[PDB]
């Protein structure tokens, strides 16, 4: 599998510079995770086994986050990538799903498989979003994370005074609706690439 | 003295510029409010201040007419 | 443009990159269309009780739904 | 008033 | 470092530059083209199509063309010290020009107009028009 | 004062079609009485079709406004 | 005393500077409404303020005309 | 019979001031539809209000020209 | 060949404004077309409405011009 | 002497507005072309329509000048 | 016989341009305000500078007008 | 007879608007190039077209001035 | 009196265009500041150069007025 | 030659429109160069081309003035 | 010098226009500098050329006035 790992490291170092900038731009707007509203988790995962317990750690974090956001009274919805997350939550939190995806990595990772999922979210516009994944620190260790994400409803409640340093060639109100979508796509891109690399590094245990 | 009427009319043939200025003001107000409603409470103030000049000008452009009409 | 047609920006971007790739040369066009394959299996739920499971091999049929 | 059509009216 | 333009030109699949120093860049914004150098103001812009053009410090006159379908550009000012102004050019599909053709362009154009003859839906018509634009751009930008 | 403004508006929007039906017709009658060719009369027939579209457009406008009254 | 009937028209020539103001104003109203519809209720409001002055100016250009036509 | 004509022909210059302003209004309406076709209406009404006011101004100028022609 | 000719020529100083209004209209039309072809025949429609007033106004001038040349 | 000459020239000072309208119109075309270089026949068509109307008004002004000259 | 008043008026016609200039100033001000309030005051400052010239010019006009109405 | 010179000079006041139009047009061209220097020519073409019409206007104005002068 | 004072005021009618120029200029100053304040003071300079020309014209006009009123 | 001098002075008012044209022209040049310096030289030529036309207006006005001055 | 004075006073209504022109120029420059400061000099150079031509015009009109004040 080391070969696949070389390929995935290459895709990261050749697909991260793409995503990083717009995300580090739009994160200039602070996101209050304790905000209220219809949550929407995108718990990423794998599709096979032999990956250690990375999916276990993902599902653990998701269980905790949901048991939290439900005691606070916020409705919940669970999006996913992979049948492992399904098998790991279909019984405990099977009443909350809204959409799930599989057979993703049968073919190499691309931008289309991310644009599609981003569109499914936009069309299913929730008030607040969240993403979970396994950042690929080193070839022998990873780090699970939870990215909060800026949704249109969190944006409309902000005059966006943090970006006024920037000059948007089309006016802000004419470019924001396309920049948020690019942001979602780049987000999913980076998260899944890191998840894949972590999965593979585990498989080579 | 029929000329005084002509002069009073002439002196009154310049509120058009005043009106075009006011139009520019409130157009930019409305626009700048479309791009940022949260700040209306300031976009208004400054607008008023601008008028605080035009109006004055306008008054002159009116006042003097009467003068030029009698004297 | 697309906004008025009830459409996203990513749909436009991808459906135009498709044409661009179709306007390429072979030793690189085959590579591209290899690295840009698509295979999804979308599944929907509603309190459980799946409403549908649909496969997607191409971009247009995926976005249309 | 060489400009009879115009001069006559005002300032004759 | 130095007072050069640290270009980074990125596609999802192959980053061609990362922090490469250059003198001048051209990028086809939505309104119109725009050229970027040092000193330019912190800006963002959406792209629509066209042939990015890069000119290096060691080249000056030697150029490098790169076609682009859609995407964004983000020009950020230097850190307090580096003296180096950074530019991100994020293109869903960045292509060099040696790797383009005019026959397949015309063929895809005809295919698109055929698919668009059945003009009933909004997205179909918009797609036909935007494709016309992109393919014309390719043909004029192609060898 | 308002009542004068509003009756003026009303009367203008009531006569807007009457003009395009009567005075433009008189103008075209003058052109016909002055000219006798056919080519110029060909452009004239085109322009008469245009004036027909014009009368229908003015009718639409007056109807819209009156509906707004 | 035909000069009076001249001063009247010379005064009414101003209205061409008022109409342009109103036009630009409502153009900005419309355009702004094409970006942030959800706040039309404010735009119109502010717009009215503008007109609340423009018309007044216009009225003068008319009123004084009558004056310059009789007195 | 020699001055009234001048007065009327002079009052018919406000019209060129008005047509400008109507042109801008409808140009802004057009571009507004081009930016957000989802709302053609909710613009046409505001456009119509502005155009009513401008048509009123035009009526004033024409009417007063006719007056000064017969007075 | 007296003053009535002067008046009928002065009454053709308004056509400038009409032409500028029409230019603004069709320029905005061309722009909103280049920006959204899918709705050409919608824009055009609204465009025509504007003409219904401008053309009209212009014609009035011309007509009134003759009214003064053959008082 | 030839007051008809003055009437002609006066009536012939309106081509400025016509020319300005034409320029603005063709400017929008060229702009709209630079933005959408494949959509030109439609822009050219609408341009030619507006130019027909403008040339019509300009020909009116010129012919009326000549008339007032050879009155 | 009262040419002094005529000259005073012809002087007080220029105020239109001054008003238009002031309007463009404060329009850009509220615009720049809507686009970057964090610098708001600075803009105000610079704006005033321009006024300090316009008004000056304006003053002269009115001042000079008086000089003519009394000589 | 010195009036013919008056009428001529007056007839030439249109060249101003003509030049203004030509300026707007060439500004549109000079922009369209920067915005899209791939073409540089089709814009040049439509430019020469518009300048064809504008040159016709300027030329008839000049010739009419010389006419009204010599007569 | 009449003729000289008339000429003075006339010459002093060219103080409006100057104000319009200054308005456009400071408006662009304000806008270019809002878009990029880190070079604020490197823009002010240029506007001053503007005065160095514009102001002169203004001054000159004023000067000539007095000359025309004392010659 | 009083009336000849008035004819000259009235002719020069073509200038004032020419200047606005050249201003818009070189302003579009300046801007389109701040955007895309890679093409600077090209833009220049185009302006010159345009300038040509405008120049062959300016002098004419001036020249006609001289013509109308020396009868 | 009764009428030469009016001829001069009329010769200086172009200046206004000129001013406008200049204004526009510098406006553009300023903006095209708030965008790309590193390209001040180039812009400046081009700008001068503009001013150059404009000043010539300016100069011309002023000088003609003096001529029309003596001749």
């Amino acid at each position: 599998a080391a070969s696949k790992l070389r390929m995935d490291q290459r895709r990261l170092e050749n697909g991260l510079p793409f995503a990083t900038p717009v995300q580090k731009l739009v994160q200039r707007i602070p996101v209050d995770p304790k905000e209220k509203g219809t949550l929407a988790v995108l718990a990423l995962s794998s599709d096979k086994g032999l990956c250690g317990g990375v999916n276990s750690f993902v599902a653990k974090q998701a269980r905790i986050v949901i048991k939290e956001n439900e005691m606070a009274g916020n409705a919940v919805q669970v999006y996913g990538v992979g049948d492992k997350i399904r098998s790991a939550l279909q019984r405990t939190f099977g009443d909350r799903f809204k959409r799930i995806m599989t057979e993703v990595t049968r073919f190499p990772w691309n931008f289309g498989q991310a644009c599609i999922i981003a569109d499914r979210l936009m069309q299913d516009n929730p008030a607040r979003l969240m993403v979970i994944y396994n950042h690929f620190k080193s070839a022998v260790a990873y780090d699970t994370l939870t990215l909060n994400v800026l949704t249109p409803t969190q944006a409309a409640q902000s005059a966006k005074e943090q970006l006024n340093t920037f000059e948007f060639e089309p006016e802000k109100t004419d470019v924001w609706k396309d920049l948020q979508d690019f942001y979602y796509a780049c987000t999913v891109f980076g998260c899944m690439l890191d998840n894949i690399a972590s999965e593979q590094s585990a498989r080579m245990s | 003295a029929g000329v005084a009427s002509l002069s009073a009319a002439i002196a009154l043939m310049s509120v058009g510029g005043v009106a075009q200025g006011i139009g520019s003001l409130f157009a930019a107000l409305v626009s700048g409010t479309a791009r940022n409603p949260s700040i209306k409470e300031d976009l208004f103030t400054y607008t008023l201040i601008g008028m605080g000049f035009l109006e004055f000008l306008g008054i002159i452009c009116v006042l003097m007419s009467a003068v030029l009409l009698y004297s | 443009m697309w906004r008025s047609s009830g459409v996203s920006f990513t749909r436009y971007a991808s459906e135009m990159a498709a044409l661009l790739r179709q306007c390429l040369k072979e030793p690189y066009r085959t590579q591209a269309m290899q690295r840009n394959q698509i295979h999804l299996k979308e599944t929907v739920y509603q309190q459980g009780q799946v409403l549908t499971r649909e496969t997607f091999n191409d971009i247009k049929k995926a976005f249309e739904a | 008033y060489p400009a009879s059509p115009v001069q006559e009216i005002f300032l004759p | 470092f130095k007072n050069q333009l640290l270009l980074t030109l990125s596609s999802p699949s192959e980053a061609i530059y990362v922090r490469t120093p250059v003198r001048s860049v051209t990028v086809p914004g939505s309104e119109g083209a725009m050229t970027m150098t040092n000193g330019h103001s912190q800006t963002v812009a959406r792209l629509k199509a066209g042939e990015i053009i890069v000119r290096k410090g060691e080249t000056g006159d030697e150029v490098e063309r790169f076609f682009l379908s859609d995407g964004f550009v983000l020009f950020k000012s230097p850190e307090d010290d580096s003296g180096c102004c950074t530019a991100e050019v994020l293109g869903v599909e960045v292509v060099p020009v040696s790797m383009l053709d005019k026959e397949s362009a015309a063929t895809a154009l005809q295919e698109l107009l055929q698919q668009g003859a059945g003009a009933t839906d909004e997205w179909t018509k918009a797609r036909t028009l935007l494709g016309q634009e992109l393919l014309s751009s390719v043909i004029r930008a192609a060898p | 004062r308002f009542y004068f403004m509003y009756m003026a508006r009303t009367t203008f929007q009531a006569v807007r079609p009457l003009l395009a039906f009567s005075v433009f017709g008189e103008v075209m009658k003058l052109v016909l009485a002055t000219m006798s060719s056919g080519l110029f009369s060909f452009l004239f027939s085109f322009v008469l079709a245009f004036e027909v579209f014009y009368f229908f457009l003015q009718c639409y406008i007056s109807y819209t406004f009156l509906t707004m009254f």
Side-chain angles (χ1 to χ4, degrees), chain B residues 21-22 25-26 43-57:
Chain B
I22 295 175
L25 273 176
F26 281 56
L43 262 46
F44 197 55
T45 285
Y46 296 170
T47 295
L48 302 190
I49 286 156
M51 306 294 294
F53 296 110
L54 300 202
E55 205 68 1
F56 175 78
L57 268 46

Side-chain angles (χ1 to χ4, degrees), chain A residues 22-24 26-36 38-44 117-118 121-122 125-133 145-157 176 179-191:
Chain A
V22 59
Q23 289 168 213
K24 296 188 164 182
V26 180
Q27 288 164 346
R28 294 166 77 107
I29 312 186
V31 195
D32 187 352
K34 305 163 290 307
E35 158 180 4
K36 275 193 172 291
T38 299
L39 184 76
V41 172
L42 185 88
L44 297 157
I117 308 162
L121 304 159
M122 206 64 52
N125 200 45
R128 39 181 307 205
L129 187 65
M130 182 178 316
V131 176
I132 289 161
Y133 66 112
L145 287 173
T146 82
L147 261 191
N148 271 266
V149 164
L150 186 75
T151 54
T153 64
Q154 303 152 274
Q157 296 167 107
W176 194 243
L179 168 60
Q180 219 171 9
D181 312 339
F182 209 76
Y183 168 56
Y184 279 29
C186 300
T187 284
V188 163
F189 209 60
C191 295

Side-chain angles (χ1 to χ4, degrees), chain F residues 52-64:
Chain F
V52 162
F53 291 153
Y54 206 57
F55 162 68
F56 282 118
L57 161 60
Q58 297 301 351
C59 172
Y60 157 83
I61 286 164
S62 60
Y63 166 80
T64 284

Side-chain angles (χ1 to χ4, degrees), chain E residues 14-74:
Chain E
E14 216 175 18
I16 318 168
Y17 306 69
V18 191
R19 289 267 179 152
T20 318
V22 305
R23 260 167 184 154
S24 65
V25 181
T26 288
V27 306
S30 180
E31 311 293 15
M34 72 185 83
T35 299
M36 300 207 150
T37 79
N38 220 330
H40 198 296
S41 172
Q42 262 195 9
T43 192
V44 171
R46 157 171 87 210
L47 307 180
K48 58 173 207 183
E51 47 175 354
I52 292 154
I53 311 178
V54 185
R55 328 193 177 88
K56 265 83 75 170
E58 195 170 289
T59 57
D61 43 9
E62 214 60 33
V63 304
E64 279 289 327
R65 285 195 164 72
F66 285 128
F67 206 94
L68 188 166
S69 176
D70 314 289
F72 269 58
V73 66
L74 307 168

Side-chain angles (χ1 to χ4, degrees), chain F residues 14-30 51 55:
Chain F
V15 302
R16 197 180 274 271
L18 186 67
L19 304 202
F21 199 44
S22 309
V23 311
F24 283 36
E26 285 294 334
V27 158
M28 298 308 186
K29 288 174 224 298
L30 297 205
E51 296 295 0
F55 162 68

